[PDB]
Amino acid sequence: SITAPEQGTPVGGVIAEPSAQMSAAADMATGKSVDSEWEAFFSFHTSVNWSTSETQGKILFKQSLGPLLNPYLEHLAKLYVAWSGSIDVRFSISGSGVFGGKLAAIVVPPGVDPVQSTSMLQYPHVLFDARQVEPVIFSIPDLRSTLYHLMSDTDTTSLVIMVYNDLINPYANDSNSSGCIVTVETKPGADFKFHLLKPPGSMLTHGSVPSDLIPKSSSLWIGNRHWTDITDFVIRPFVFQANRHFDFNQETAGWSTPRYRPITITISEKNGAKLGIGVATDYIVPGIPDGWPDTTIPEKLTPAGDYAITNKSGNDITTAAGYDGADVIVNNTNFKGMYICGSLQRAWGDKKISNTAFITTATKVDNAIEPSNVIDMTKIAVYQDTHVGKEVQTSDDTLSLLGYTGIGEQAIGSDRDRVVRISVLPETGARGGNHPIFYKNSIKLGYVIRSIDVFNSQILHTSRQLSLNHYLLPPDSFAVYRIIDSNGSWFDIGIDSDGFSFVGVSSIGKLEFPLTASYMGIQLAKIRLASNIR
């Protein structure tokens, strides 16, 4: 009656049965020794730089226990609820007998928040030198109070590397930090065992690793603030953006999403109003449209007319040699720090074809505007002529971010006081010895053929993936990616949980821009990154 999980009467492949003589010939092709190959070799995990500046009592490496330290296990942990056992983490220092500088290695028990202090060495520490020949192992054990862990547990053993004698090398410089890198590799260990099989469905599928946060080329790259391509990297000890600045918690202070689509709004007038309070038709925050930008006007101004710029404060000029041939530029215009959206400008029963628009945030007072930066449903602003005579219009509209007006300016996203934030502005400063950056992105200007330089905190493709995918990182680490200009030089970039990019060099300069990108691993936040220039 009963039949078990294997029972069932056999008849076999009727025309022929499986011949082991065959399957051996497959093993005769390969060098197939045994399954579970991952229990018999090592795997790359990350690689940590160690410059001159890393004074002792300062950590390089820090990883808890678990299967995620070896992706072959990470692929199998989806099939088993639980695990148990040890893990071996190899180490190997670059600089082949050239350098000095011991380096510690500690296993800590579970339930701690380690500290960059020498008191961590008031504890059994193993040391090894930068003149190491054979790489080093450090079998981590599994110390625990329960019989078997789960995949969600964190209160586990954890390894740390910390500095014990600062290095020595006369072959480096203050700017670049080519040299020491501390490769780390892993292996499951003998006693390692998964436990408690599960059927797929469930296959929870969390543990997403940073590997697609940037493409592997430039031509795909675009700033989150503006649609045009990248051409340069810019440093600034501070950094700030809110429109699309996403973090690994998959959230922001940003009213917008990471899609350069147009902006639909239903403006309304009474008699002859050019300007009005644009209103949402699509949104994620109530009142504010999606894709709506962030830069206030500089000043109070009454938008009422056409372009006008004057050199010398004594002239008016409409040509290139007069533009460059200029003491200064003045911009005697009434819609100065504004934008250039497209404005399909529809309505019921309204000929006199669409015209161009001009938009910012600002507080409107009965014929004019003034800069406010705390955007609400009232602060929206437009200056398109929808042909309104003596009657409400009900002008539906669509708008796509397309340019600027504020000639005389020379950058955007540099005056934080003019940046539109809802209530809070995300922001950082230098860390470790690393500093923030922006991504430069040229932009249109309107009446004049020239362009102007934007600052951007995030590639869009970076900000898109964070909107969706639950990537993993601690609070005090990066998701390092590499950069290689086409002169052969290179530098690294880090990405904090917040999303602000970070870098380790002091300067960049010009470079062969047709460049690439790749993923090295994870790196503790509070360390100078690596680099090599020219």
Burial code (b: 16+ CB inside 10 Å, e: under 16) for 83-120 equals bebbbbbbbebbbeeebebbbbbbbbebeeeeeeeeeb
292-351 residues in contact with K ion (CB under 5 A) are 350
CA distance linking residue 92 with residue 103, whole number of Å:
11
Interaction pattern, residues 383-422, with its own copies; x per rule: CB under 8 A: --x----------x-x-x-xx-------------------
427 interacts with, out of K ion, its own copies, none, CB within 5 to 8 A per kind: none
Q: Is the CB of 350 or the CB of 385 nearer to K ion? A: 350
Stretch that binds its own copies, among 73-81, 160-168, 240-248, 284-292 (CB under 8 A): 73-81
270 interacts with, out of its own copies, K ion, none, CB within 5 to 8 A per kind: none
264-303 residues in contact with its own copies (CB under 8 A) are none
The DSSP symbol for 289 reads P
- Count of residues that bind its own copies according to CB under 8 A: 176
Q: Is the CB of 157 or the CB of 398 nearer to K ion? A: 398
CA distance linking residue 302 with residue 300, whole number of Å:
7
Stretch that binds its own copies, among 160-168, 180-188, 412-420, 503-511 (CB under 8 A): 180-188
Q: Does 236 bind K ion (CB under 5 A)?
A: no
φ and ψ of 73, to 5 deg: -75, -35
| CA distances, 131 to each of 36, 94, 103 (Å) | 34, 9, 11
Q: Is the CB of 138 or the CB of 513 nearer to its own copies? A: 138
Strand 181-187 to 139-140 pairing: unpaired
**Per-position DSSP letters for 218-246, written without gaps between them:** STT-BBSSSSSBP-EEEE-SSEE--SS--
Interaction pattern, residues 436-475, with its own copies; x per rule: CB under 8 A: --------xxxxxx--------------------------
- Which residues have CB under 8 Å from 463's CB, separation 6+? 224, 244, 245, 246, 258, 499
77-136 residues in contact with its own copies (CB under 8 A) are 78-79, 81-82, 84-86, 90, 92, 94-98, 100-102, 105-122, 124-126, 133-136
Residue of the chain from 68, 279, 326, 344 that contacts its own copies (CB under 8 A): 344
Q: Does 424 bind its own copies (CB under 8 A)?
A: no
Residue (of 531, 526, 483) closest to 505 by Cα position = 531
Stretch that binds K ion, among 92-100, 286-294, 322-330, 353-361 (CB under 5 A): 353-361
28-47 residues in contact with its own copies (CB under 8 A) are 28-32, 35-37, 40-44, 47
377 interacts with, out of K ion, its own copies, none, CB within 5 to 8 A per kind: none
Q: How far is the CB of 268 from its own copies (least distance, A)?
A: 14
Q: Does 507 bind its own copies (CB under 8 A)?
A: no
3-class DSSP assignment, residue 396? strand
- Which residues have CB under 8 Å from 346's CB, separation 6+? 354, 395, 396, 397, 398
Strand ranges (DSSP E) for 98-201?
103-108, 126-128, 139-140, 149-150, 158-162, 181-187, 193-197
Q: Does 352 bind K ion (CB under 5 A)?
A: yes
Q: Which residue has the closest beta carbon to K ion?
A: 350
CA distance linking residue 107 with residue 110, whole number of Å:
9
Binding residues for K ion (CB under 5 A): 350, 352, 354
